[PDB]
Amino acid sequence: NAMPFLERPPKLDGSLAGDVGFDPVGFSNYFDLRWLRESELKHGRVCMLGVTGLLVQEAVCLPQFSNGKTPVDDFFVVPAAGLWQVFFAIGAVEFFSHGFKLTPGDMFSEGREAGDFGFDPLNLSGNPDALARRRLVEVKNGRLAMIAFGGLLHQQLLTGQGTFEQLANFKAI
Amino acid sequence: FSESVPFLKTPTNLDGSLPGDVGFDPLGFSEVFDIRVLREAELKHGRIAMLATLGYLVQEAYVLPFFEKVPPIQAHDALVKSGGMSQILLWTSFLEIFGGIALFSTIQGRRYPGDFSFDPLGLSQGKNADKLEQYQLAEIKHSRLAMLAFSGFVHQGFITKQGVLEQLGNFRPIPGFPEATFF
Numbered sequence: 624n625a626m627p628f629l630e631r632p633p634k635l636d637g638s639l640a641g642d643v644g645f646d647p648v649g650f651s652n653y654f655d656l657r658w659l660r661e662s663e664l665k666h667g668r669v670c671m672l673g674v675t676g677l678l679v680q681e682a683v684c685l686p687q688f689s690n691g692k693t694p695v696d697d698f699f700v701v702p703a704a705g706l707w708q709v710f711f712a713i714g715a716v717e718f719f720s721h722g723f724k725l726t727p728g729d730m731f732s733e734g735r736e737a738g739d740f741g742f743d744p745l746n747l748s749g750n751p752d753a754l755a756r757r758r759l760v761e762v763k764n765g766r767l768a769m770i771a772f773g774g775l776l777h778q779q780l781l782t783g784q785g786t787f788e789q790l791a792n793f794k795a796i
Numbered sequence: 797f798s799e800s801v802p803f804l805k806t807p808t809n810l811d812g813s814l815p816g817d818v819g820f821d822p823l824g825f826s827e828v829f830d831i832r833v834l835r836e837a838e839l840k841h842g843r844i845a846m847l848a849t850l851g852y853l854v855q856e857a858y859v860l861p862f863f864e865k866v867p868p869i870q871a872h873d874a875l876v877k878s879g880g881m882s883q884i885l886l887w888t889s890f891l892e893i894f895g896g897i898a899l900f901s902t903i904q905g906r907r908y909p910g911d912f913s914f915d916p917l918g919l920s921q922g923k924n925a926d927k928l929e930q931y932q933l934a935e936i937k938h939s940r941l942a943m944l945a946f947s948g949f950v951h952q953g954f955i956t957k958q959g960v961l962e963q964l965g966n967f968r969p970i971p972g973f974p975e976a977t978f979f
């Protein structure tokens with residue numbers, strides 16, 4: 624296990640992917656595991672997209688936009704009206720995907736498993752074994768994306784330099 | 797009577813169950829509090845003291861190329877304002893949250909006090925379990941020794957303004973005392 628000196632969490636069973644028994648506090652003991660897994664998948668997917676955005680906006684800038692010194696500054700140079708529609712379009716996407724069941728009690732009522740919405744433009748989710756492998760890869764890369772996005776954002780905020788450009792010259796503080 | 801102290805009795809709940817039990821508990825600490833919680837505290841103190849003693853020796857002997865060469869107390873003072881001490885505190889606290897979780901597991905029986913199953917190398921894990929208790933004894937002894945040694949170090953550094961290797965090389969008395977003349 625992840626904590627050999629501790630015991631396995633009671634609510635934690637190996638049904639979900641990425642289960643290593645890592646829950647030293649009892650978040651799963653006090654909150655629904657389906658809700659926690661949905662939040663984990665949402666954070667991980669948002670962080671994958673954020674990592675790609677941080678690595679791309681330093682290299683590619685839209686012609687109808689101003690290119691800031693860093694992607695964090697790319698956020699600032701965008702007009703606030705664009706940021707607000709981004710916010711409200713994401714909110715509309717949340718409303719459509721959750722079926723107007725934002726509250727934790729209303730969510731997971733009509734099955735939906737945990738963190739599943741229905742998204743397969745290309746059918747790569749047929750066989751259950753490959754589906755489970757894809758789930759494990761997805762959750763691991765999502766957690767790695769959370770850590771990596773935190774690191775990239777904070778290093779960009781501190782040094783004021785892009786990630787690849789920071790790799791060009793370290794400039795230790 | 798107690799083994800360590802001939803004129804005292806064996807301190808009740810103090811037997812060979814825990815390593816290094818010479819019956820030394822003149823004040824009833826093992827009766828006011830659980831003996832396993834006290835053993836966890838002793839192991840934490842001793843391990844931190846061993847690391848601190850080794851760090852004192854090496855820092856007096858050697859310094860990294862990206863750190864200012866200063867006495868260890870001056871190193872603490874300099875890196876408090878530099879942020880390195882903040883980093884050490886943050887990561888140590890992050891580990892010690894899970895350490896406290898393990899301690900709470902220890903309180904309700906279960907895991908052995910001070911045992912984290914930490915063994916990157918094959919030492920007393922498999923094929924060497926028969927030495928494990930021996931190792932345990934050695935560990936606590938070193939712990940206790942370190943808990944004294946580091947202490948002496950710093951207080952000697954407080955009285956002579958010298959490193960421990962400097963005091964070993966040049967064992968001059970307490971400053972101002974060779975002149976004496978107190979009357």
Ligand code: CLA
Nearest residue numbers: 641642643644645646650651659660662663666766769890
């Ligand atoms: C917010 C993101 C998020 C969420 C909701 C979850 C949720 C979950 N994880 Mg995942 N996980 C995450 C991020 C997240 N994780 C990251 C970033 C990593 C990489 C280290 C992991 C690695 C991981 C493993 C290896 C495992 C889980 C498991 C689980 C499940 C049980 C544990 C739990 O309840 O944690 C709840 C977690 C939170 C509520 C987030 C923590 C919030 C605290 C209060 C803030 C402190 C965190 C901070 C960033 C650390 C600072 C450190 C300091 C030195 C600066 C649950 C579904 C286990 C599982 O599959 O069980 C089903 C399992 O085995 N997770």
Ligand code: CLA
Nearest residue numbers: 669672673675676679680683684685688689690697698701
């Ligand atoms: C967490 C995710 C995230 C966030 C908050 C932002 C936010 C922002 N981006 Mg970045 N970006 C992202 C991801 C993200 N981006 C990704 C993944 C890419 C690679 C395609 C880019 C590439 C990119 C460029 C090239 C530029 C920005 C720019 C901007 C700013 C203006 C908004 C805009 O034009 O959107 C642009 C959005 C896109 C090009 C694509 C939308 C991002 C994802 C794919 C939407 C997800 C929706 C849906 C759930 C996914 C399903 C579809 C899937 C098959 C992909 C704003 C600060 C501009 C800027 O200010 O730079 C100066 C700009 O020029 N972004």
Ligand code: CLA
Nearest residue numbers: 774793794795796875878879880881882883884885887888
């Ligand atoms: C692994 C995560 C991690 C990260 C990202 C950082 C980040 C940082 N630490 Mg470190 N630190 C960590 C863990 C980490 N710390 C741990 C576990 C300890 C022991 C308790 C310390 C002890 C420590 C001390 C004592 C000091 C710092 C300092 C710093 C800061 C200055 C960075 C620097 O020297 O320039 C950039 C770094 C370099 C030039 C060194 C080379 C690093 C290489 C290139 C990167 C290698 C990978 C890197 C270690 C990431 C590891 C994780 C990754 C493998 C996933 C920076 C914010 C210093 C500070 O506060 O600033 C004044 C400082 O004095 N840290």
Ligand code: KC2
Nearest residue numbers: 688701702703704705706707708709710711712713714715
């Ligand atoms: C969240 C997804 C999203 C949706 C679903 C969506 C729908 C529509 C529709 C549909 C009915 C129209 C007709 C429309 C038109 C304009 N959008 Mg657009 N839009 C979205 C995203 C963004 C962002 C991120 C920005 C943005 C902007 C503008 C400007 C500004 C030009 C000007 O400066 O006058 C105009 C005219 C920018 C802005 O508002 O700030 C300056 C800006 O950054 N939009 N938009």
Ligand SMILES: CC1=CCCC(C)(C)[C@H]1/C=C/C(C)=C/C=C/C(C)=C/C=C/C=C(C)/C=C/C=C(C)/C=C/C1=C(C)CCCC1(C)C
Nearest residue numbers: 645673694695696698699769770772773774776777780890
């Ligand atoms: C709106 C907003 C505000 C201001 C402007 C803005 C910046 C553009 C924007 C962005 C805001 C944003 C999006 C800000 C984003 C902030 C983020 C994502 C911060 C992430 C922090 C993650 C940390 C410290 C992880 C540490 C990992 C550890 C200790 C790993 C531990 C590990 C574990 C547990 C397991 C194994 C052992 C080890 C390896 C030890």
